[PDB]
Design a protein around this ligand. Structure first.
Ligand SMILES: [Mg+2]
Ligand SMILES: [Mg+2]
Ligand SMILES: [Mg+2]
Lengths: 268, 272, 269, 270, 267, 274
């Protein structure tokens, strides 16, 4: 690598935006590479304030990306996500899986249609069963397709562990333990309902925002438990009982899924 | 988007304020687009300190907006909130819902009249019942119409969670648990009395303001419990016992409140 | 509002000080208005670092205002609280309330006189009686008039609860629970006796100071309970027996009270 | 407080130091008043970066006061505190009290002597007795004269409650409870033996220091208690039994000044 | 050292990067030394802003270093790690040791092949047994060879104790006590699984990132414990029963990977 | 003082480094004193950003001091520590003491030789016995000589209470209570082993570093206790049974010069050679 040797900020931002580079380290490094055949990248390594520029660039790209994502309605967004996916794919992969778990695909379609609209008390789908039934498998593939974020309950003692909810269009909590379910029960009923919530962000002001659609995987059946009574109404449960690993849903599978079931998932 | 090829900050703030953009994300993006015509927006994209300008702009805007909003009387405010509410709607759906819960709309009206003026011991309305009775949905629709804020007891361990009581004209604590009621019982006593309290910040300023009218929803009946005796006379309870467990469930909207308020403006002592 | 179009900061601060604006948002807004008729306010809107100037102006103002009030004598401070409070006012309001709860006015005037002077053992007046006898009512009204602060002792979690004491001329402990009294009994004798106490604050250094005068409200009669023997000589109880559900004390009432009884409260400056 | 109509920071810091103002709001307000008859104070209000200077200034003065207090030997330090002592009392006021509490001046003078040097196991003087025997009275008067600091065991749940030990030359832990004494036993053995303790400070990294001289008051006799065996050889105790109660004793700063000026020899402060 | 005496930042960074100096103190000091025979190092000591240059340099180097590590495939990465190792070595050292613990090397090769790919439920290998059975010994040597990071559960009450997971290609938790296993069970199943995980960085904002392969050493057999039921499926256990001290070097691992390249599916 | 009245930062740092002043208040005050006969110190008092320069100076010094301490090997480091010690001394002071505690000096030498190399499971020496047996006495004198740091278990609820491990070459925990041993057992086995650990530092970034050699003094005998089973293999215990005081005198007191004598004499057997 070379980092040695008039700089325009905007151009670097343009570049960063185009390549979807949102991360300070990647932006810095990847631009320093562009330096061999880019006079602006060359100029960037000539400035003594490159550190700040990398920082401001990431801020700037984050601003734009966030703003784009927020502007789109769910259909237009899924549309963009479909455009993004590549590879061989079939909704039949998804069908087969649900059929393997002895679930009619329509049951999922119905729930998914409403989940996507973020309708109160329907804003949370939970995939529940004994280990190795493709729960994490499925939810992760979908969250990936959608460009959703994973929430890490491991960081719940922090104020900003929910900060991504100010940006993403769907979110996942993977392997909700009893501690996890209780926290949700106590503090995050409104977020599970998909009502507005005050979201704390690092260098920014708090935003009040509709908590986006939620996914949860767990071994714990909330509907069956009396002590999670108040969650019964806001959580739709899909029970995955059958063992699997082979079964492997790609992005292209979801692309196929949404394209096939566009009308049937009500996406006007 | 295009973010490339002297700047005046005040001009950007003017634009942002007029368009009422107070989020950096939006200010950043939207101004970048306005670069084709408006050539201050063009100057903006040629500065190496774009990021700061966005930051500062959001600050500057939300300063002004907060400041006009405090300057308004509750009447004049609700007015702006009606002016802001769009779509087709009717107060009948509010009537329908209370009557559904076997409550006369006039019981609600009375309470609301006093609650809007923030009268001592009338400052907090609670909607209490078993799960699925329209508590959250009623309150949220109101708070939404009112432009109020939703406090999250999740962050309660840091007093900073009440920061927004400094800014907004009404607040909701959605789904109060015992823990949360106990919190009211020790701290927010003064809020339920009209005597000012001290609100803190991450950007530490440490002001003192009269507390905005509160809404609470809860599965816990406070009037029924002695460990919450103080709150009995200071919290007005509306018991919702009828469930709505059966495509889109029932929904109150901005327009529904808009008409509710235009129709009942008189009876609500909002006259000026 | 107009926010568009050489700037002198001190001038802005001067202005802000004059209008008593300590409020970033208010400052920002009000200056931008007073601007088609102030060369400096206009100049402010020309500057790119407006956001900084507002922040600094606030800081600067809250410094001056804070420091100017910290420097007053107790009498001078009350004279300030008197100027600051306006409205429909009579002390007759208070006198009848005391008469309703069967407390002689002079008992209270005296006690207050010595309380405002923060003499040890005279430093803490408790108001005691069963729920709903206007204890909060009265104390809040007084502390408000005086611009003091309100403290709630929760339990353990209340670690920083005394943090405001670092700063106010007076304070009120709202509904002292039994544990709150034990806290006094255990950790606060020095405060009551006129000695320095370390007061922990959030994200700044602890401070050592003489405890401001304290009002307390409680259902617990510390004079009666021998397990608080040590507070008996340090706390002066006013017993409120009569339930009230009309009475309402105001900033304007206290004003009249203080102006009327000025000579009798020994505030002679 | 007129604020309107080339600034040297030095001149300001100086002014703040001279007047021993360490606290921003005071510094700001007080300098603004000086501006009537002070060119640099006048130049200050002409600056756009006033807030920055007021901050810096506080930080600057805080640095100096803190570091000069640390730099002086215990005798020179006491010497300084004698110069600060205003009014006029007498060392006799102090002697009279000890006479009343039936304790030996000589015992005290020695204890204090060694306590002042912070000699291992001589570093902590307990003042023990039932309530209202003038324990707080005497200890606080001594701390005051000394420029000491009070530690509140109330704040012990934060470990920052000891922060001031990285600063004072003498410290008082008032009204020790059992909780507190076994705290000492548990955590502070090194403070008593004159070995190093890591004292955590809030906004900056912890420092290792030798704990300055310590006073304690308490209703609890550590020497008479078995669970504090370690403490017996490290804590020098004095029992006060005598009431101090009229709706009579008030040791002043001048009292202490006279005490030290007069027993200077006997305290080994040469 | 000498600290007194036109500065170019980029050259300093270049330098720091070349020497792989990533931390402020080292950078500052080591550069101040270069000052005798480097005009840019000389010019650095002439600036009144050297403090922030050292700071920014560190920032800039970790940007680059992180970015170049993240860019490499696991094969390409191990390749570079092999290039880095020096000295005398043999995979036999490793074979001998697994054989000593009565474990066929192929069992380990199979597990490692998958672990390196970060396959779900296969992302975590645990070395388990009574004290002094070369558990920490082996895991540490591997983590060293790989340039992986240590996690310190001692800091688990902080938000940033997992912050290295945003940078390393492999991680180790050494001596998981019961408290440690429980924390993992409660909060980090997905991390163990090697699914995407939101990782809180100190002054930057969080990143969503796939969790690197994991090594744990412990006296606690999770597989045998009913209360760690939910960990059974995501943790492959290697039981080290035999005591010992013997040592595995970088060059041993270099030998190991080179020899077993194809058998490890490193194309 | 006089705090009043062009500046070169490097020179102030040079100064601060030379005087090994690393701590902001000392740096500011001490330099303000140098102002009488130093034009750079005089210029410092003329700038408006003194507060910052003091701040940056401390940063810079800390950088240099840490960096130079980490660069040295253990031998070269002890070497520099010997150079630093002054006064009358003899290793016999040390011998006499161990002999007084009925311990052969060679037992300690053997342990120390390995402890200094920071060999796994040998990275921690605990001195254990009833009160007043010179445990803290000895450990502190050694830590002092080595320029090691003391960890204070009073601060253990903070992330940063271990922050010194990123800097010192030896470290001591004095008077380990039961709470203390348990914390070590639960959270800190591998640091007791002297394996790489992630040490969190306050304002800066966490650092991954080899945990330095450890000393512990305690009234609690971990080897005898079944509940500290897993500490048995990583802690070498020296039992001090004999009193080191009556509260007349205190006969045993090891100086820096005693250790200087100790290491110089026993350089070979501690394998601190080429
Ligand atoms: Mg799973
Ligand atoms: Mg609800
Ligand atoms: Mg191990």
């Amino acid at each position: 690598t070379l980092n040695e040797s008039k700089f325009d900020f905007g151009t670097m931002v343009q570049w960063a935006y185009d390549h979807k580079y949102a991360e300070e380290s990647k932006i810095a490094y990847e631009y320093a590479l562009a330096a061999g055949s880019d006079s602006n990248a060359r100029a960037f390594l000539a400035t003594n304030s490159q550190a700040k520029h990398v920082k401001d660039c990431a801020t700037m790209v984050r601003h734009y990306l966030r703003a784009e994502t927020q502007a789109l309605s769910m259909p237009a967004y899924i549309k963009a996500r479909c455009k993004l996916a590549t590879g061989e794919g079939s909704w039949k992969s998804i069908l087969t899986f649900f059929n393997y778990q002895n679930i009619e695909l329509i049951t999922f379609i119905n729930a998914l249609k409403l989940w996507l609209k973020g309708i109160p008390k329907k804003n949370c789908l939970a995939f529940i069963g004994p280990p190795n039934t493709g729960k994490s498998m499925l939810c992760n593939s979908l969250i990936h397709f959608l460009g959703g974020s994973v929430l890490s309950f491991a960081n719940h003692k922090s104020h900003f562990w929910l900060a991504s909810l100010a940006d993403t269009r769907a979110a996942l909590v993977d392997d909700a333990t009893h501690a996890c379910w209780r926290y949700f029960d106590t503090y995050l009923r409104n977020a599970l309902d998909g009502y507005p919530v005050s979201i704390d962000r690092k260098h920014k002001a708090a935003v009040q925002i509709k908590a986006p659609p939620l996914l949860v995987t767990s071994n714990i059946d909330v509907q069956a438990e009396d002590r999670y009574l108040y969650l019964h109404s806001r959580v739709q449960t899909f029970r995955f009982e059958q063992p699997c690993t082979p079964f492997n849903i790609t992005d292209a599978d979801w692309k196929s899924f949404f394209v096939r079931l566009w009308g049937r998932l009500d996406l006007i």
